[PDB]
Amino acid sequence: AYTTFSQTKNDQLKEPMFFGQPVNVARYDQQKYDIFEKLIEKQLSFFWRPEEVDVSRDRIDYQALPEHEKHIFISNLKYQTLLDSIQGRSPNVALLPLISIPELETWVETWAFSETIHSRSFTHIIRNIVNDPSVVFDDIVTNEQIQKRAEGISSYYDELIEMTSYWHLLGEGTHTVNGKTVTVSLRELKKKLYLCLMSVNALEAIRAYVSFACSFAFAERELMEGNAKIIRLIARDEALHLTGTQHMLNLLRSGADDPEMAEIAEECKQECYDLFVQAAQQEKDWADYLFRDGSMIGLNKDILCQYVEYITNIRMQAVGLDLPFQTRSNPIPWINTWLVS
Amino acid sequence: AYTTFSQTKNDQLKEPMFFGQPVNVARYDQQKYDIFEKLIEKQLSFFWRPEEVDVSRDRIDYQALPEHEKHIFISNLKYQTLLDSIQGRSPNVALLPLISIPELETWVETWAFSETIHSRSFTHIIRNIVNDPSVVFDDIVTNEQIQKRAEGISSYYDELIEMTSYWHLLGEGTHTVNGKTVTVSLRELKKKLYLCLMSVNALEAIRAYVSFACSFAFAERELMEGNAKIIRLIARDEALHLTGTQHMLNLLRSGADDPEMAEIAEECKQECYDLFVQAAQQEKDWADYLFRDGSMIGLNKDILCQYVEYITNIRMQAVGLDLPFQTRSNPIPWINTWLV
Ligand SMILES: [Fe+2]
Ligand SMILES: [Fe+2]
Ligand SMILES: [Fe+2]
Ligand SMILES: [Fe+2]
Ligand SMILES: [Hg+2]
Ligand SMILES: [Hg+2]
Ligand SMILES: [Hg+2]
Ligand SMILES: [Hg+2]
Ligand SMILES: [Hg+2]
Ligand SMILES: [Hg+2]
Ligand SMILES: [Hg+2]
Ligand SMILES: [Hg+2]
Ligand SMILES: [Hg+2]
Ligand SMILES: [Hg+2]
Ligand SMILES: [Hg+2]
Ligand SMILES: [Hg+2]
């Protein structure tokens, strides 16, 4: 029920962001919500090439670092590599099949494309600070701790994709597949979408930022400055990605785009609160692990867990969820020097 | 069965290009086929912004243009806009879910992305030469000839996507869905992907270059210089895209990748040939519409057909197919200057 070019003439300004008629013509002269055109323009103006960044002196730095500090650094780099590996492909695979307005379609493709640049940057860093990159890469997939913190990310995406396939194939209704009954509900799919967007928002809004803090702590000590420069470019991209999902979510819950989604958001609002808190919880558990055999000069588990709570409150506030933590001021205002956004 | 991050630690170097274990880690320190890494690097080095190109004079040139020359130019532009609209999303929706090596995955996403830039360049051009671009964009969907010339593109993609979904949901075998039998054969799926690739190769190798010739015809007459700069940047990208599909296809037929693909490429040779022949015939028939209000000096149906046969022969020989047309020299050698 999906087509790469819907032959029906439709007003793209009147379609919902999702589940409407698949986008046929890709035009940018007009838009239902110009936030997406704006984001595309900004992301294109930020285009950068990891290769052009010199990380030459990061090798001696990483080598001179205390063992436990190497752990903190490489562990964080590995998780970041995981995040962008998924973000490079997922928005395309998961969202393109459901988008019904061209600006959002293009935004998603541009967003995903920018994530592949991020992935490319990590290979650039790893290659210049370690002799055998394979060691690093072949420890991301099985790393028990990394799967633990990354828990739930792929699942949300995968269930959305599966429901989407059933929806496009069988359509709305009650069906039979090899003796088993399979119910396909649009309302359920919409919920799956919403939960998935919330999860991606938490990924780019908090998970990425916690890793930035870990990375810039070294930059503060004039260490791993090659990596620092690259992470600064990535955080600038992430600021945009974050804005994109916040708008998607706020537009979906406000009821202007799809009344039914507005209803759905309200009722699973508590589920969303829980998934957000769980994400922050995983970040905390990770922190506890990062500094088990040694804290870092300028960043320890305590300060880091404070930051998680601090940014979590802000992000959740931005998408209409209650604040789970105690309000406080930024525990690490020095981070602002590196977050040009 | 599809996952955005497969938990199995696998040797990405031993996976086949398609249908293997979905890619988990996106690494670029190694590759089974360095050709895709090379294509990514080159495409990234070619990054350009459409709007950055000055198309100010084009409005005047276009307005001053004879009415039938406007039609030729715009009809060509509308088709190009359609191809890039499809090529911006399709490679990602149809191929991404089936790729099993990182370099190819990122290449497809980079390739698809470069297409949205092409699409954006058309909006840039349109919005700058006509008072209301909505009068151009709207007809793209309903224009019968357009739908007739591009006929068959979305079909291949859509059929591949549907079969892929059945595969990821049910896996191989003979299943029962709503009291009906649905067979899911991986071999049959490989055939679909293979013919889909051959078809994209025909689109970017022939359909695109035919449109370039029309655009550049005006360039030689010192008209629409802004459009030509843009078309000259697009063609540069497209040369990488076609190089990319030619390599996917040739690598599959070599047997060096998935053995079954090599056999399938062998069994489907006539289909191969037939779709190139048909795509060529469609380009010719489009001429009858492109020159309804009359042709122009240096660009007519006769020359269009000659070019089509000429370029098709070259493209088909590049992927090991027999040449259907009589041999001939380039009917428009002046295009070589704009193609680089
Ligand atoms: Fe990223
Ligand atoms: Fe991101
Ligand atoms: Fe293109
Ligand atoms: Fe292309
Ligand atoms: Hg999502
Ligand atoms: Hg998700
Ligand atoms: Hg750190
Ligand atoms: Hg941190
Ligand atoms: Hg780090
Ligand atoms: Hg929710
Ligand atoms: Hg295709
Ligand atoms: Hg294809
Ligand atoms: Hg195609
Ligand atoms: Hg032509
Ligand atoms: Hg063939
Ligand atoms: Hg073929």
From Swiss-Prot, chain A:
Notes on how activity is controlled: Inhibited by hydroxyurea, leads to dNTP depletion, replication fork arrest and genomic instability.
Keyword Metal-binding: yes
Induction of expression: Induced 4.2-fold by hydroxyurea (at protein level).
Family the entry assigns: Belongs to the ribonucleoside diphosphate reductase small chain family.
Cofactor(s) recorded in Swiss-Prot or TrEMBL: Fe cation
Gene Ontology CC annotations of this record: cytoplasm; cytosol; ribonucleoside-diphosphate reductase complex
Protein name: Ribonucleoside-diphosphate reductase 1 subunit beta
Gene3D superfamilies, per the entry: Ribonucleotide Reductase, subunit A
Active-site residue list: F122
Assembly notes: Tetramer of two alpha (R1) and two beta (R2) subunits. The B1 protein is a dimer of alpha subunits.
GO MF annotation list: identical protein binding; iron ion binding; ribonucleoside-diphosphate reductase activity, thioredoxin disulfide as acceptor
SUPFAM superfamilies in UniProt: Ferritin-like (SSF47240)
Enzyme class: oxidoreductase
EC number: 1.17.4.1
Residue sites binding Fe cation 2 per the record: E115, E204, E238, H241
GO biological process, one term: deoxyribonucleotide biosynthetic process
Co-factor: note: Binds 2 iron ions per subunit.
Reaction(s) this enzyme catalyzes, per UniProt: a 2'-deoxyribonucleoside 5'-diphosphate + [thioredoxin]-disulfide + H2O = a ribonucleoside 5'-diphosphate + [thioredoxin]-dithiol
Signal sequence annotation: none
Key words of the record: Deoxyribonucleotide synthesis, Iron, Metal-binding, Oxidoreductase
